Design an enzyme around this catalytic site. Structure first.
Site, mmCIF file in Angstrom:
data_model
loop_
_atom_site.group_PDB
_atom_site.id
_atom_site.type_symbol
_atom_site.label_atom_id
_atom_site.label_comp_id
_atom_site.label_asym_id
_atom_site.label_seq_id
_atom_site.Cartn_x
_atom_site.Cartn_y
_atom_site.Cartn_z
ATOM 1 N N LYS A 31 -50.821 22.702 -11.165
ATOM 2 C CA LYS A 31 -52.067 21.962 -11.299
ATOM 3 C C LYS A 31 -52.316 21.137 -10.077
ATOM 4 O O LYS A 31 -53.469 20.865 -9.780
ATOM 5 C CB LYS A 31 -52.093 21.110 -12.562
ATOM 6 C CG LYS A 31 -52.119 21.996 -13.818
ATOM 7 C CD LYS A 31 -52.445 21.152 -15.039
ATOM 8 C CE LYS A 31 -52.734 22.038 -16.237
ATOM 9 N NZ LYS A 31 -51.504 22.395 -16.953
ATOM 10 N N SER A 52 -46.938 24.062 -14.833
ATOM 11 C CA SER A 52 -48.015 23.088 -14.680
ATOM 12 C C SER A 52 -47.943 22.246 -13.408
ATOM 13 O O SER A 52 -48.918 21.553 -13.139
ATOM 14 C CB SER A 52 -48.121 22.170 -15.893
ATOM 15 O OG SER A 52 -48.212 22.941 -17.085
ATOM 16 N N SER A 107 -52.136 17.950 -19.104
ATOM 17 C CA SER A 107 -51.769 19.276 -18.641
ATOM 18 C C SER A 107 -52.498 20.380 -19.415
ATOM 19 O O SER A 107 -51.899 21.253 -19.963
ATOM 20 C CB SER A 107 -50.253 19.428 -18.761
ATOM 21 O OG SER A 107 -49.799 20.211 -17.674
HETATM 22 C C1 LIG Z 1 -47.319 23.367 -18.023
HETATM 23 O O1 LIG Z 1 -46.276 23.681 -17.435
HETATM 24 N N1 LIG Z 1 -47.541 23.580 -19.319
HETATM 25 C C2 LIG Z 1 -48.812 23.099 -19.910
HETATM 26 C C3 LIG Z 1 -48.282 21.885 -20.680
HETATM 27 N N2 LIG Z 1 -47.714 20.951 -19.771
HETATM 28 O O2 LIG Z 1 -47.124 19.867 -20.331
HETATM 29 S S1 LIG Z 1 -46.076 19.425 -19.294
HETATM 30 O O3 LIG Z 1 -46.563 19.184 -17.958
HETATM 31 O O4 LIG Z 1 -45.444 18.224 -19.840
HETATM 32 O O5 LIG Z 1 -45.048 20.359 -18.962
HETATM 33 C C4 LIG Z 1 -47.302 22.349 -21.750
HETATM 34 C C5 LIG Z 1 -46.156 23.131 -21.110
HETATM 35 C C6 LIG Z 1 -46.594 24.246 -20.159
HETATM 36 C C7 LIG Z 1 -47.150 25.480 -20.826
HETATM 37 N N3 LIG Z 1 -46.968 25.796 -22.209
HETATM 38 O O6 LIG Z 1 -47.801 26.240 -20.128
#
Ligand SMILES: *C(=O)N1C[C@H](NOS(=O)(=O)O)CC[C@H]1C(N)=O
Ligand SMILES: *C(=O)N1C[C@H](NOS(=O)(=O)O)CC[C@H]1C(N)=O
Lengths: 243, 242
Positions: free
Chosen positions: B50, B47, B95
């Site tokens: 992003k 993430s 996220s």
């Molecule tokens: C990003 O890495 N993700 C989406 C989401 N992000 O939360 S985080 O920034 O605290 O890491 C959950 C984890 C992850 C995913 N499952 O893709």
């Protein structure tokens, strides 16, 4: 219906041996709330809250190139220690560094200051007095509800200055941020002309709404300055806007 | 330009953890890390991607602005905050992967690649699915590379509009008070070993900026909070934040 009076908020003033007004505007609902409608519409000197329109004008005219441009300290040691150093727009706003903003106003000049403020529909739009202090001891006057109208324009980039200048100013207004909310605001303390009053104006950004606010309160001594934020936060907490 | 400070391992070890914090003092133009080797180890950005993705989406007009609503597609996913309409601020805050997958699809393979090349972003390799390469594709970026990318974003030196860079920096806002401002993005690479957590961004002080990029082994979600906590323990040790 557009503006409702909620006298329960006086408790927050009375409990702090103070008197004033908090004006709240729920952007989604397009409804406003205040403990005192009359004082909410009472025009006062904006004092340092003028740093918001002043910053905007200075940025749009190129008097301020950007938020990193350094405004050197003129060597004169003033009562507030944080002013006796170099600043940029972020820290000039954070510390409400008067001399920097006075220099901006002189560079902007009376004619442009006047006509740019008309564009902002800012208070009474009267800049009578010294070009470097009218916001403090001049003719200009703005109410809490007028601060909200002005701030809503700034928020929506609807002022008649560049998007960039509005974004930079909203950056410079950043006061506090956490996972529950973001506050962009500016304090003010009108000391030169009675009644001496303290301001806090800006807004709180939530995930799915924005709550604009403008408060002012009697401030006969600087000892109450922290109440500008504290009373506001008590109102916001009461209203479940912040936890 | 990169100096090792092993004392910071205390903050990993004491938390029954392993990782790297990389810090860059913008004024002094000096970098500090607890592990030089891991500082340069390229991992999936997850993430943290992003950041460039928002940038690219904004610059190409895929995202009109930070208020544009990205209607929830209707699929209910595990993280409850993703099951609702979002804008760029909240999509980033929580996220919200689906919103970003949809951006990557609109941007397209060709423009994505061009942009990452122009950004000198990690290995610049978008191999894998257009909508997941940052999670299970070929893209790899190190902590020090994150810093290099973030410094560009901070100075509006990336080759996207100044506006895009400002909007993304707004969207990165995590915490602010009278002592500092943190603009950052968390990440958690779950799909390809080693499972790691990320926190990259910076802390703005009155007279300096400290860029940071940390990543850490994340075999269980129990340690997700340590991404911030370890970094802050380091920042606190260096007197960057109180
Ligand atoms: C990003 O890495 N993700 C989406 C989401 N992000 O939360 S985080 O920034 O605290 O890491 C959950 C984890 C992850 C995913 N499952 O893709
Ligand atoms: C602004 O009203 N002023 C400059 C400075 N601001 O501090 S404040 O933002 O907390 O209000 C000191 C007060 C006042 C002034 N004396 O000019």
């Amino acid at each position: 219906k557009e503006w409702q009076e909620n006298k329960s908020w006086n408790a927050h003033f009375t409990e702090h041996k103070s008197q004033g007004v908090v004006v709240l505007w729920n952007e989604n609902k397009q409804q406003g709330f205040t403990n005192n409608l009359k004082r909410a519409n009472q025009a006062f000197l904006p004092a340092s809250t003028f740093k918001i329109p002043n910053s905007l004008i200075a940025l749009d005219l190129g008097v301020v190139k950007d938020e990193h441009q350094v405004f050197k300290w003129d060597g004169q040691t003033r009562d507030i220690a944080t002013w006796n150093r170099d600043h940029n727009l972020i820290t000039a706003m954070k510390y409400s560094v008067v001399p920097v903003y006075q220099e901006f106003a002189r560079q902007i000049g009376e004619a442009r200051m006047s006509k740019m403020l008309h564009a902002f529909d800012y208070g009474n739009e009267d800049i009578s007095g010294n070009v470097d202090s009218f916001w403090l001891d001049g003719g200009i006057r703005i109410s809490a509800t007028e601060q909200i109208s002005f701030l809503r324009k700034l928020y929506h980039n609807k002022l008649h200055v560049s998007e960039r200048s509005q974004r930079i100013v909203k950056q410079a207004m950043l006061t506090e941020a956490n996972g529950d909310y973001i506050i962009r605001a500016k304090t003010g303390y009108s000391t030169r002309i009675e009644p001496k009053i303290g301001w806090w104006v800006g807004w709180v950004e939530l995930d799915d709404n924005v709550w604009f606010f403008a408060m002012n309160m009697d401030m006969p001594t600087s000892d109450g300055l922290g109440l500008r934020q504290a009373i506001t936060k008590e109102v916001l907490k009461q209203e479940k806007i912040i936890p």
